[PDB]
Design goal:
- Chain B: Immunoglobulins are composed of two identical heavy chains and two identical light chains; disulfide-linked.
- The complex is a heterotrimer of chains A (225), B (206) and C (213).
- Chain A has 225 residues and is mostly beta strands.
- Chain A contains no helices and 19 strands.
- Chain C has two domains: 108 residues, Immunoglobulin-like, CATH 2.60.40; 101 residues, Immunoglobulins (Immunoglobulin-like).
- Helices cover 5% and strands 46% of the residues of chain C.
- In chain C, a hairpin with a 2-residue loop joins β14 and β15.
- The chains are: A mainly beta (225), B mainly beta (206), C mainly beta (213).
- Chains in contact: A-B, A-C, B-C.
- Chains A and C meet through β5, β12, β13, β15 and β16 of A and β4, β9, β10, β13 and β17 of C.
Chain lengths: 225, 206, 213
């Protein structure tokens, strides 16, 4: 059994700093070069840095050189990553890794990975999402009435549960939800609602309504028909 | 006084993280004065002094004069001659000794794991075998591990000089048949100079 | 160094999934493979080209020669559904390059045609001196589509940020693609198009900065 446990911090404002840590167990730390590999929230892994057994050889990623400082402590079975001059682009899940090589110059492979701690770099912490309506155009005969969509942006952190309301009881209780995207220090998420023609069944659809359920920062924007 | 020069641990030369040493020890000192001298001739270069510090691990009346020598991995793996020139106020002349790795072109070991003989299943503790053959030099290192943890209950036979000029050995892990029945996966890890990363391991399961 | 592996690979149970890891003279390097399950840290399934770590099933075989490394999975099962990454240490510059990743979608249900609609940035956004094109893709299986943006035919690379497909709950997968551009850029083009390729099929919608006057 081998376990690499990371700590570090979490959410931070750009420019600020964070020092990550990784305490290892289940193997001789002195014998293996440890590495840090991050994973951008939503797409692929990216190698960050690495350091030899005796600290002698330190190496970094080009997109990190100068900012991040990788360290280790054999006596304490710990690997660190001093993240200086943070940037929003650095928002990723940082993984700790154990290699397995004995030859002088080996083609490293990450034998063991930690669960991965998360660092979020952005300005505002809790933000009230600014809701902007999206409209297409009238349609019915050539194809399904695309109607309109609701674009919720400027919220942070996530924890969003949007809901569209009508003047009467929402019969067809459904909504085309979508994933939130990692934007520059903020999040954004749309919600589309296809409309089966303009069936004015008593309730006159003067304008559709869109509301966002978010802890701290409740908003409701008016959308056309 | 008889002198005995000893080589470094096979693991110690194969992994860059360890420090391979050469040991010069002596037994039966002459009754007089302990005036000793050391001249470590490293096939050309010379350290002379090195770290000749006899940490007298005195138990009862025993205590010998040991002299370790920090060795550069490659220098040992390239066939350099490490000589120890021991002397003492009593010996007629200085006795020298010289060691180097088994001179010869290295051969990558072939590792094969063998499950328990069906006859052994009648017993409570079945044994897992690991055949490591066709390697050279003899200097090798074999260990066993289950779920990323070394298993201490195993023995390894010394290298037998096969007909092919190469060597071979067997490592036997002893595991409760209950554990073997559970479909656990054990691995035979072998370290040797001529291996891709000085490492390789083969697993066993049910 | 550069590694290149197909975005997705859909194979029905029983069949063999062969994941290709492209690399220039990759045969001189030892490819490694990792398996990353949703919400789980990646695991080393194959290393040094063909070696398998204790415990990883036999059906996982590694291959590598010339300009291609090929991860092969015999008798593909549902539990083998995750992202596979091919990594290689570039000896020439001391950097560990990972591939883009491949989504091994073990086929279960039939393939669904993606419905895509591009919405123009509302005037309110323009008022805030910003312009965002929102391309919504929904009801598609396998959950993997390549979305591309292009202004007046020419592809726009900067400002794009697409979300990964999500099955949410309705079984079918969905996604969203954004193009955060300046309000002036939006007005300085005849038309903008969002093209989503769902395995061969490329469907695209166009939104022009003007329709009539």
């Amino acid at each position: 059994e081998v376990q690499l446990v990371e700590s570090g911090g979490g959410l931070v404002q750009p420019g600020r700093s964070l020092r990550l840590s990784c305490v290892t167990s289940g193997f001789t730390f002195d014998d293996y070069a440890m590495h840090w590999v991050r994973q951008s929230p939503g797409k692929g892994l990216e190698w960050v840095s690495g350091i030899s057994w005796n600290t002698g050889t330190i190496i970094y990623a080009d997109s990190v050189k100068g900012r991040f400082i990788i360290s280790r402590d054999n006596a304490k079975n710990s690997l660190y990553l001093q993240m200086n001059s943070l940037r929003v682009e650095d928002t990723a899940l940082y993984y700790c890794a154990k290699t397995r090589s004995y030859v002088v110059a080996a083609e490293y492979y990450f034998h063991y990975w930690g669960q991965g701690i998360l660092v979020t770099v952005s300005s505002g912490s809790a933000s009230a999402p600014t809701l902007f309506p999206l409209v297409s155009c009238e349609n019915s005969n050539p194809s399904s009435t695309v109607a309109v969509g609701c674009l919720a942006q400027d919220f942070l952190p996530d924890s969003i549960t949007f809901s569209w309301k009508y003047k009467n009881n929402s019969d067809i209780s459904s909504t085309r939800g979508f994933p939130s995207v990692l934007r520059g220090g903020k999040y954004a998420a749309t919600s589309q609602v296809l409309l089966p023609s303009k069936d004015v069944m008593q309730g006159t659809n003067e304008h559709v309504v869109c509301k966002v359920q978010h802890p701290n920062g409740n908003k409701e924007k008016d959308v056309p028909l | 006084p008889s002198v005995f020069l000893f080589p470094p641990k096979p693991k110690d030369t194969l992994m860059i993280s360890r420090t391979p040493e050469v040991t010069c020890v002596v037994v039966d000192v002459s009754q007089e004065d302990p005036q000793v001298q050391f001249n470590w001739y490293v096939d050309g270069v010379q350290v002379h002094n090195a770290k000749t510090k006899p940490r007298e691990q005195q138990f009862n009346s025993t205590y010998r004069v040991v002299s370790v020598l920090t060795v550069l991995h490659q220098n040992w793996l390239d066939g350099k001659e490490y000589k120890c020139k021991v002397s003492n106020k009593g010996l007629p002349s200085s006795i020298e000794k010289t060691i180097s790795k088994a001179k010869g072109q290295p051969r990558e070991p072939q590792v094969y794991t063998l499950p328990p003989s069906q006859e052994e299943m009648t017993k409570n503790q079945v044994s897992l075998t690991c055949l490591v053959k066709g390697f050279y030099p003899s200097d090798i290192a074999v260990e066993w591990e289950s779920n990323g943890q070394p298993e201490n209950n195993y023995k390894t036979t010394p290298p037998v000089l096969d007909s092919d000029g190469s060597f071979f050995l067997y490592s036997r892990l002893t595991v409760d048949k209950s554990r073997w029945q559970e479909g656990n996966v054990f691995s035979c890890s072998v370290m040797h100079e001529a291996l891709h990363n000085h490492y390789t391991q083969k697993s066993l399961s049910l | 160094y550069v590694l290149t592996q197909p975005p997705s690979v859909s194979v029905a149970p029983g069949q063999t999934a062969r994941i290709t890891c492209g690399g220039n003279n990759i045969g001189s390097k030892s490819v490694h493979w990792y398996q990353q399950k949703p919400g789980q840290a990646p695991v080393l399934v194959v290393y040094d080209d063909s070696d398998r770590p204790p415990g990883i099933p036999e059906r996982f075989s590694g291959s590598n020669s010339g300009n291609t490394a090929t991860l092969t999975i015999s008798r593909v099962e549902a539990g083998d559904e995750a992202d596979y990454y091919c990594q290689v240490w570039d000896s020439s510059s001391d950097h560990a390059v990972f591939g883009g990743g491949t989504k091994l979608t073990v086929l279960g249900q039939p393939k669904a045609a993606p419905s895509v609609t591009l919405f123009p940035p509302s005037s309110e956004e323009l008022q805030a001196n910003k312009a965002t094109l929102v391309c919504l893709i929904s009801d598609f299986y396998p959950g993997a589509v390549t979305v591309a943006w292009k202004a007046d035919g020419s592809p726009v690379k900067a400002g794009v940020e697409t979300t990964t497909p999500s099955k949410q709950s309705n079984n079918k997968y969905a996604a969203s693609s954004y193009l955060s551009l300046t309000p002036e850029q939006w007005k300085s083009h005849k038309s903008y198009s969002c093209q989503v390729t769902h395995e061969g099929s490329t469907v695209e919608k166009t939104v022009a900065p003007t329709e009539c006057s």
